[PDB]
Design a protein around this ligand. Structure first.
Ligand SMILES: Nc1ncnc2c1ncn2[C@@H]1O[C@H](COP(=O)(O)OP(=O)(O)OP(=O)(O)O)[C@@H](O)[C@H]1O
Ligand SMILES: [Mg+2]
Lengths: 51, 506, 57
C-alpha cells in the first residue's frame, strides 16, 4: 500500500505532464505575444536602471 | 496533489527573478557544434573548467580557453543546441552538492537526485577538482578495514586511507569483493561508535542502468543502502558526465573525511573513465599520446586517487579509502592504463579467470596480489598472536613452488602439499556471505594445528562451518574475547588451541 | 503515517490486535514423557545395580 501511493505520486505528475500540453497549447493562441513585448520593455528598463 | 502546484509556482517566480537579473553582454554566440563539442565566440572573462548554461538548457564545462573561441564540452546531448545560441555563464567552477542527506539516495555525476525520491538535503557544495592533502596533514594507516573475505583479510590487509586495486579480467568477481565489503560494514554501521563507522560511496561509470538497478536492489535487500550513496554514469550519458562523476564522488567522500568520519569509495571500472577522457580530448582536437589516449591520463588518475588519505589527529583524524577497479584485456597487465593504475595504487587484488574456473571463487592470485601495508592496517587477532598469519604468504608461495616441478621428495614435502591444498580449499567463500574476524581467527588457526586430518577435500567446507558452529555454540567466550580485545592472549591462545584440538578429535 | 490514503491500516492494526493472542503453547506431554523416563529409571538402575555389584564381585 506504500508503493501504490508512490505510484500514485508518479502517475499524478504524468498527467500533469500532458496537462502542460493542454497548458502550453493554451499559451500559443493569445494576443499576449503582442502584449508580452511590453513586458520585456518595462523589465529591461528595470534591469539596467539598477546598474 | 495541489502542494507541488504552488511549489512549482514559487519555483517559476524565482526562475523569473534569477533569469531577469543578468544583463550580461559577454554571453557568447555558438559558432559550431560537433559531436558533443561546441566552440563559442564570447565569454572573454570565462574561468577555466567553468560551468555554463546554454539557452536551450544544457550544461557545459570550459576545457579549452584558446584565444577568440572557447571549447565547451556538453553534459548531455547536442540534440537541442544550434549555432548562434546565447550561452549563459554560471560565475562559478563546476560544483557538486555535499552533505549527510545523500545517504540512501542515487544521484548522477552533477549530483541531481536521479532515483526519484525528492530533492537532496546538502550541507554544502564542494568543488570537483580539489587539492589532495599535503605531506604533513595526514597520518599513516593503522586502523584495518574488515572486508569479510578471509583471503582479502588475512592475506592482503587493507585499512583506512589506503588504495587497493581490484585488477582483473571481465566478470571475474571485481564488483563482488566491493559489494561484499559494503555488506560487511553493516556490522559496525548499525552501532554508535563513529570511529568505526564506514559509510560507502560507489561510482558506476559506464555500467548499464539495469546493472545498477540490480545493485541497488541488492544493497537495499541486505539493508546497506541506508549508509551508502550511489553515483551513476551510464554509457548512455555524455562522456563529460562520465569523466566528471568520479571526481564528484571523491568530493562526496572527502566531506566525511574532513568532518572526522570514515568513508569508502569504490572506483568501479576506472578504465571507462579513461576512454571517456579519450573521447573528450580527441573531440577537442587536443594532440593525442600513446595509442590515441590523451597524454595526461596518468595525472588524471593520480589526482583522483591520491585524494583518498588517512588524516592526522590535528584536523580530525578522518579517513577515505579508495577501492578502484580496472579490467584488463586477456590478462595483459602490461597494458598502458593497467600499468599506470598498478603504479598509482597502494597495492592490488589480482583476480583471474583461470583460478575462477579452478573452483576458487574469490580467484585471488596470492602470488601477485600484494598490499603495501602488512602488519599496519590489520586486526591483531589475525596477526603475530596467531603467529603464522605473519607468514602464510611464504607458505602459499612455497606450496605453489613445489606443485610438480618441485616434486614431492620426502614426508615434509607431502605434509606441505596436503597443508597447502587443504588451505586453498579452505579459503574458498561464497558471494553475499560476509564473515567476521572473530570467526576468521578459529578457521585459519585450525589451519596450523590439524588441517591435514580434515575429512577429505570435498567435505572441508562443512568442516569449517561446523567448526564455526562448535565455536559459536558452547564456546562464545572465545569469540567474544577475541572480538572486543582484538588479539589473542597467552591464556587465550591456550584456550583456542584446546578448542581446536577438541573439535579435531571430534 | 507514510500512507496518506490509509483506509486499511487501522483495520489491519486492529486485525493484528484481535489476533494478538495468537495461540497458546502445547504442554500436553505430562503422562507419556515421564513414561519414557519411568522406563529410564527402571533400566538405568537395573544396569547400575548390576555393574556396581559386579565391579566389586
Ligand atoms: N564468491 C562468488 N560466488 C559465486 N559466484 C560469484 C562469486 N564472485 C563472483 N561470482 C560470479 O562471477 C560473475 C562476475 O562477478 P561480478 O558480478 O563481481 O563481476 P565483475 O568481475 O565485477 O565483472 P564486470 O566488469 O563484468 O561487472 C557473476 O556471475 C557472479 O555471480
Ligand atoms: Mg562487476
Amino acid at each position: 500500500w506504500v508503493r501504490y501511493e508512490a505510484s500514485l505520486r508518479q502517475l499524478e505528475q504524468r498527467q500533469l505532464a500532458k496537462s502542460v500540453i493542454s497548458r502550453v497549447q493554451s499559451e500559443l493562441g493569445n494576443p499576449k505575444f503582442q502584449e508580452k513585448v511590453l513586458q520585456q520593455s518595462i523589465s529591461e528598463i528595470e534591469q539596467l536602471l539598477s546598474k | 496533489k495541489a502542494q507541488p502546484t504552488e511549489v512549482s509556482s514559487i519555483l517559476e517566480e524565482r526562475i523569473k527573478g534569477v533569469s531577469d537579473e543578468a544583463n550580461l553582454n559577454e554571453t557568447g554566440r555558438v559558432l559550431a557544434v560537433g559531436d558533443g563539442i561546441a566552440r563559442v565566440f564570447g565569454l572573454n572573462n570565462i574561468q577555466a573548467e567553468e560551468l555554463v548554461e546554454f539557452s536551450s538548457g544544457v550544461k557545459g564545462m570550459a576545457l579549452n580557453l584558446e584565444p577568440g573561441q572557447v571549447g565547451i564540452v556538453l553534459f548531455g546531448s547536442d540534440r537541442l543546441v544550434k549555432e548562434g545560441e546565447l550561452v549563459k555563464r554560471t560565475g562559478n567552477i563546476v560544483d557538486v552538492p555535499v552533505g549527510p542527506g545523500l545517504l540512501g539516495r542515487v544521484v548522477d555525476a552533477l549530483g541531481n537526485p536521479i532515483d526519484g525520491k525528492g530533492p537532496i538535503d546538502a550541507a554544502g557544495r564542494s568543488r570537483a577538482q580539489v587539492k589532495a592533502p599535503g605531506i604533513l596533514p595526514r597520518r599513516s594507516v593503522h586502523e584495518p578495514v574488515q572486508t569479510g573475505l578471509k583471503a582479502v583479510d588475512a592475506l592482503v590487509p587493507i585499512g583506512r586511507g589506503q588504495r587497493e586495486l581490484i585488477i582483473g579480467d571481465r566478470q571475474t568477481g571485481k564488483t563482488a569483493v566491493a559489494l561484499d565489503t559494503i555488506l560487511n560494514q553493516k556490522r559496525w554501521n548499525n552501532g554508535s561508535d563513529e570511529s568505526k563507522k564506514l559509510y560507502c560511496v560507489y561510482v558506476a561509470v559506464g555500467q548499464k542502468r539495469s546493472t545498477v538497478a540490480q545493485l541497488v536492489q541488492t544493497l537495499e535487500q541486505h539493508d546497506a543502502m541506508k549508509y551508502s550513496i550511489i553515483v551513476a554514469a551510464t554509457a548512455s550519458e555524455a562522456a563529460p558526465l562520465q569523466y566528471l562523476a568520479p571526481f564528484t564522488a571523491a568530493s562526496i567522500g572527502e566531506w566525511f573525511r574532513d568532518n572526522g568520519k570514515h568513508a569508502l569509495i569504490v572506483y568501479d571500472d576506472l578504465s571507462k573513465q579513461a576512454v571517456a577522457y579519450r573521447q573528450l580530448s580527441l573531440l577537442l582536437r587536443r594532440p593525442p599520446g600513446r595509442e590515441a589516449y590523451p597524454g595526461d591520463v596518468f595525472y588524471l588518475h593520480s589526482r583522483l586517487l591520491e585524494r583518498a588519505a588517512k588524516l592526522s589527529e590535528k584536523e580530525g583524524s578522518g579517513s577515505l579509502t579508495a577501492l578502484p577497479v580496472i579490467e584488463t584485456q586477456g590478462g595483459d597487465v602490461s597494458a598502458y592504463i593497467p600499468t599506470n593504475v598498478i603504479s598509482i595504487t597502494d597495492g592490488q587484488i589480482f583476480l583471474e579467470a583461470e583460478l575462477f574456473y579452478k573452483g576458487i571463487r574469490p580467484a585471488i592470485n596470492v602470488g601477485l596480489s600484494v598490499s603495501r601495508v602488512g602488519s599496519a592496517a590489520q586486526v591483531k587477532a589475525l596477526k603475530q598472536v596467531a603467529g603464522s598469519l605473519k607468514l602464510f604468504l611464504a607458505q602459499y608461495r612455497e606450496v605453489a613452488a613445489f606443485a610438480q616441478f618441485g616434486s614431492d621428495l620426502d614426508a615434509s614435502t607431502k605434509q606441505t602439499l596436503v597443508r597447502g591444498e587443504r588451505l586453498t580449499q579452505l579459503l574458498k567463500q561464497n558471494q553475499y556471505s560476509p564473515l567476521a574476524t572473530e570467526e576468521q581467527v578459529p578457521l585459519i588457526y585450525a589451519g596450523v594445528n590439524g588441517h591435514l586430518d580434515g575429512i577429505e577435500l570435498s567435505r572441508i567446507g562443512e568442516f569449517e562451518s561446523s567448526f564455526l558452529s562448535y565455536l559459536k555454540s558452547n564456546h562464545n567466550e572465545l569469540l567474544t574475547e577475541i572480538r572486543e580485545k582484538g588479539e589473542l592472549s597467552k591464556e587465550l591462545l591456550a584456550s583456542l588451541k584446546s578448542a581446536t584440538e577438541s573439535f579435531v578429535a571430534t | 503515517s507514510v500512507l496518506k490514503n490509509t483506509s486499511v491500516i487501522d483495520k489491519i492494526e486492529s486485525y493484528v490486535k484481535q489476533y494478538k493472542p495468537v495461540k497458546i503453547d502445547a504442554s500436553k506431554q505430562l503422562q507419556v514423557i515421564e513414561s519414557f523416563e519411568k522406563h529410564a529409571m527402571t533400566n538405568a538402575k537395573e544396569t547400575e545395580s548390576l555393574v556396581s555389584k559386579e565391579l566389586k564381585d
